[PDB]
Amino acid sequence: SALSLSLLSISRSGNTVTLIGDFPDEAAKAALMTALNGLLAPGVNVIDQIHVDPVVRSLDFSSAEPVFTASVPIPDFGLKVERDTVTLTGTAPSSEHKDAVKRAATSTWPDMKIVNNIEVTGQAPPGPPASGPCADLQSAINAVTGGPIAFGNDGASLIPADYEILNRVADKLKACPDARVTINGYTDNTGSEGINIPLSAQRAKIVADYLVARGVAGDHIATVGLGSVNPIASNATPEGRAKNRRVEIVVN
Known part of the structure; x- marks a missing residue:
């Protein structure tokens, strides 16, 4: 008709x-x-x-x-x-x-x-019909990052010197907020000699600003600087600062 x-x-x-x-x-x-x-x-x-x-x-x-x-x-x-x-x-x-x-x-x-x-x-x-979302992405992300970022004790497994992976994760990270995200900051503490706490706190802010710039909803982003705690290594040598200087990104 x-x-x-x-x-x-x-x-x-x-x-x-x-x-x-x-x-x-x-x-x-x-x-x-x-x-x-x-x-x-x-x-x-x-x-x-x-x-x-x-x-x-x-x-x-x-x-x-x-x-x-x-x-x-x-x-x-x-x-x-x-x-x-x-x-x-x-x-x-x-x-x-x-x-x-x-x-x-x-x-x-x-x-x-x-x-x-x-x-x-x-x-x-x-594959699983559901628009491959940021599901269990945390487990898969570990592969994409395949690099040191928190709790690493691998003698010497793979030593990639790239940064393209970071940009890739950011893309997937922008849609990950679908859940809850928690950002922890590891550092030492001694007062003055350590001054690690202030840098760790401010450092986290920089991370959020960068991720948010990629379109990451900061409305679900949380950052907590736990210094002194879990004192992986002691604070005395340059290695001590780097040893405690750690960060982690977790999405629910």
Whole structure:
């Protein structure tokens, strides 16, 4: 019961949904409401800036509703409509999810041109379907860092002199706050001769400022400087200061 569609642009990012375009009437809007009910509404913001014009055209959502449902559990999803032109873009962690959506798009409206522009955020291999988040990342992060940072007593296992790994961890660290993060600072204490406590405290602040600059939510970041305690080594030689000078990052 159609032949052409109007220019519609819809972009979804995180928990924000921006709808802008035109509708052939109010009856068509009802169909959209059904596809929206699935989307969400609560802590999620939903705006519909669609104008009603008794001249424009729209694609029927008869067998398209099921398609939106498959893409409902996928963020960064977007859809561009332009008459005989249909382009859908978005980021899909699990390739398996895209496979199902890809078929849905083709099944949605085969009588039209469809272009799948989905990129993998680094995930695809048949793994735990859940957008490889910062889950147990703490265990995996240890591998990415594969370097000394806290409690290290390895005779001599691997001696990499790089820093690129730090930038990599920061990227993953920015989405790690999903849980709780605790930052501890190790240092000695003697008063004046040690003055390690003041430096350890201020030092932690520098770390937070850097991580936060990468997009790390400092609203869940906690720092605690425990000096004097757990006196790994004594304070007397240059090695003593470095021995106690330690830091650790833990995310729940």
